[PDB]
């Protein structure tokens, strides 16, 4: 198991424009392209990204190239991130993909909000992080995958993701 199974078994994969749980108009592996609900948006997006007239559809090697990108940028983000380095040099590689997974899903942003367990984790209260990052509306909107990724930070090891 690394990242890139990880999420792929997270994002799952797709070729042509959708809407992600949220309703925003994304394609591949879970790559966002706007916010907006302009679907011209969305393909002029798109096209920007993939560096041709795509017409809402992409292929297998554009998507893995994307993704490839954004797993990039996902851990250059932390590393960029006063708040988040220092947690994430403390932690094991397997937890480290579980930081990863969470960024990668909701941005830098989203995740600076998990002060308290940032600071679990970074304590290494397993079990109790584990109960704080529960209580949140990334766990009750998607529990099935924030369940797996909680397991990932709790434990240390791939068992969620069998
Ligand atoms: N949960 C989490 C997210 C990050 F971006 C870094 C880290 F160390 C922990
Ligand atoms: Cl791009
Ligand atoms: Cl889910």
Same mark, same amino acid.
């Given at each position: 198991?690394?990242?890139?199974?990880?999420?792929?078994?997270?994002?799952?994969?797709?070729?042509?424009?959708?809407?992600?749980?949220?309703?925003?108009?994304?394609?591949?592996?879970?790559?966002?392209?706007?916010?907006?609900?302009?679907?011209?948006?969305?393909?002029?997006?798109?096209?920007?990204?993939?560096?041709?007239?795509?017409?809402?559809?992409?292929?297998?090697?554009?998507?893995?190239?994307?993704? /490839? @990108?954004?797993?990039?940028? !996902?851990? +250059?983000? &932390?590393?960029?991130?006063?708040?988040?380095?220092?947690?994430?040099?403390?932690?094991?590689?397997?937890?480290?993909?579980?930081?990863?997974?969470?960024?990668?899903?909701?941005?830098?942003?989203?995740?600076?909000?998990?002060?308290?367990?940032?600071?679990?984790?970074?304590?290494?209260?397993?079990?109790?992080?584990?109960?704080?990052?529960?209580?949140?509306?990334?766990? /009750? @909107?998607?529990?099935?995958? !924030?369940? +797996?990724? &909680?397991?990932?930070?709790?434990?240390?090891?791939?068992?969620?993701?069998?």
């Amino acid at each position: 198991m690394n990242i890139f199974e990880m999420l792929r078994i997270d994002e799952g994969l797709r070729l042509k424009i959708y809407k992600d749980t949220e309703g925003y108009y994304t394609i591949g592996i879970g790559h966002l392209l706007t916010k907006s609900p302009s679907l011209n948006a969305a393909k002029s997006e798109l096209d920007k990204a993939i560096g041709r007239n795509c017409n809402g559809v992409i292929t297998k090697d554009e998507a893995e190239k994307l993704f /490839n @990108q954004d797993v990039d940028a !996902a851990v +250059r983000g &932390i590393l960029r991130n006063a708040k988040l380095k220092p947690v994430y040099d403390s932690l094991d590689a397997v937890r480290r993909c579980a930081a990863i997974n969470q960024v990668f899903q909701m941005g830098e942003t989203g995740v600076a909000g998990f002060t308290n367990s940032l600071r679990m984790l970074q304590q290494k209260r397993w079990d109790e992080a584990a109960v704080n990052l529960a209580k949140s509306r990334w766990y /009750n @909107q998607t529990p099935n995958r !924030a369940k +797996r990724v &909680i397991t990932t930070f709790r434990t240390g090891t791939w068992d969620a993701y069998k």
